[PDB]
Amino acid sequence: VPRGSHMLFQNVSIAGLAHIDAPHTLTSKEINERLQPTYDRLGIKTDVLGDVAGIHARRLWDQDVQASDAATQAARKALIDANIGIEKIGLLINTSVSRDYLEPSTASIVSGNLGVSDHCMTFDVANACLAFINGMDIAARMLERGEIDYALVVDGETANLVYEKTLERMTSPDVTEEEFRNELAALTLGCGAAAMVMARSELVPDAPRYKGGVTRSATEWNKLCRGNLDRMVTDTRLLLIEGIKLAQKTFVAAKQVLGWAVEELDQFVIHQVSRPHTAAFVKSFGIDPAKVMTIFGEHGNIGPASVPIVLSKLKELGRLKKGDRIALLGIGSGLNCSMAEVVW
Amino acid sequence: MLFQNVSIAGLAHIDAPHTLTSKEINERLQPTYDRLGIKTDVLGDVAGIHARRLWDQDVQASDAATQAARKALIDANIGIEKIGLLINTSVSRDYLEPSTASIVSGNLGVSDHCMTFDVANACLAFINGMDIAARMLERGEIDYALVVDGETANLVYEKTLERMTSPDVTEEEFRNELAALTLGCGAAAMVMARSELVPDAPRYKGGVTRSATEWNKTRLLLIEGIKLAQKTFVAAKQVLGWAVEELDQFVIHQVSRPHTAAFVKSFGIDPAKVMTIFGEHGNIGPASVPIVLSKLKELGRLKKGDRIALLGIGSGLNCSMAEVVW
Ligand SMILES: C/C=C/C/C=C/CCC(=O)[C@@H](O)CC(N)=O
Ligand SMILES: C/C=C/C/C=C/CCC(=O)[C@@H](O)CC(N)=O
CB of A343 shorter than 6 A to ligand 1: no
Give B164-200 as a DSSP string: TTSTTPPTTHHHHHHHHTTB--EEEEEEEEEGGGSTT
Furthest-apart CA pair in chain A: how many Å? 70
Closest to A300 (Cα-Cα) out of A170, A164, A191: A191
Ligand 1 pocket residue status of A232, Cβ below 6 Å: no
Burial class (CB in 10 A: 0-12, 13-18, 19+), B193: buried
Ligand 1 neighbourhood includes A128 CB (under 6 angstroms): yes
Q: Return residue ranges of chain A for CATH 3.40.47.10.
A: 1-204, 205-344
A:B CB pairs within 8 Å: 162
Say which experimental method was used: X-ray
**In chain A, where do the E strands start and end?**
12-21, 24-27, 57-60, 89-94, 121-126, 150-157, 192-200, 209-217, 225-227, 232-234, 267-270, 325-332, 336-343
Q: Which ligand is nearest to the CA of B261?
A: 2
Buried (b) or exposed (e) across B93-108, using 16+ Cβ within 10 A?
A: bbbbbbbbbbbbbbbb
Where in the sequence numbering do the catalytic residues of B fall?
97, 123
CATH of A205-344, one of 3.40.1350.10, 3.30.1780.10, 3.40.47.10, 3.30.450.20: 3.40.47.10
For this experimental structure, what is the resolution in angstroms? Answer: 1.9
Q: Which ligand is nearest to the CA of A157?
A: 1
Query: Exposed (0-12), middle (13-18) or buried (19+): which is B190, by Cβ within 10 Å?
Result: buried
- Residue B194 vs residues A76, A123, B197: alpha-carbon distances, Å: 39, 25, 6
8 Å CB contact between B144 and B193: yes
Q: How many CB atoms lie within 10 A of CB A64?
A: 8
Q: Between the CA atoms of A180, A181, A185 and A187, what dihedral angle is there, to the nearest 10 degrees?
A: 30
Peptide bond into A104 cis (omega under 30): yes
Cα A305 to Cα A78: distance, rounded to the nearest angstrom: 14
Q: Where in chain B is the domain with CATH 3.40.47.10?
A: 1-198, 199-326
Q: Which H helix or E strand runs over A315?
A: helix A306-316
Ligand 2 atom at minimal distance to the Cα of residue B218: 6
Sequence-ordered list of residues with C-beta below 8 angstroms from that of B129, at least 6 positions apart, any chain: B87, B88, B89, B119, B147, B149
Residue B150 CA to ligand 2 centre (angstroms): 18
In the three-class reduction of DSSP (H, G, I as helix; E, B as strand; rest coil), residue A296 is classed as: helix
Report the SS3 class of residue A65. Answer: coil
Test B91 with A103 for CB contact under 8 angstroms.
yes
CATH superfamily of A1-204: Thiolase/Chalcone synthase (3.40.47.10)
Between CA A166 and CA A243 the distance in angstroms is: 25
Bond preceding residue A17 cis, omega within 30 of 0: no
> Strand B18-21 relative to strand A325-332: parallel, antiparallel, unpaired?
unpaired
Cα separation of B9 and B224, whole Å? 35
Integer CA distances (angstroms), B252 to A18, B230, B255, in order: 39, 14, 9
Residue A43's DSSP bridge partners are: none
Q: How far is A47 from chain B (nearest CA, A)?
A: 27
CB A157 within 8 A of CB A192: yes
- The answer to the question of whether B13 is labelled as a binding residue is no
Nearest CA-CA partner of A336 in A242, A227, A234: A242
- Give CA–CA dist A132/B133, Å, rounded: 18
Q: What CATH architecture does domain B199-326 belong to? A: 3-Layer(aba) Sandwich (3.40)
The third-level CATH classification (topology) of the domain covering B1-198 is Peroxisomal Thiolase; Chain A, domain 1 (3.40.47)
| Residues in chain B closer than 8 A to A103 (CB atoms) | 91, 120, 122, 285, 315
What is the C-alpha separation between B325 and B163, in angstroms, rounded? Answer: 46
- Dihedral over alpha carbons A243, A249, A250, A254 (to 10 degrees): 150
Cβ–Cβ under 8 Å, residues A107 and A131: no
Ligand 2 pocket check: which of A103, A109, A124 to mutate, most ligand atoms within 8 Å of Cβ?
A: A103
Distance, CA of B309 to CA of B246 (rounded, Å): 10
Work out the number of other CB atoms within 10 angstroms of the CB of residue A149: 18
CA–CA distances in Å: residue B186 to residues B59, B60, B100, B108, B155:
11, 11, 16, 19, 14
Pairwise CA distance, residues B266 & B262, whole Å? 6
Query: Is-contact B134 B206, C-beta < 8 A?
Result: yes
* A102 contacts on B by Cβ (under 8 Å): 91-93, 120
Task: Tell me if A332 CB under 6 Å of ligand 1.
Answer: yes
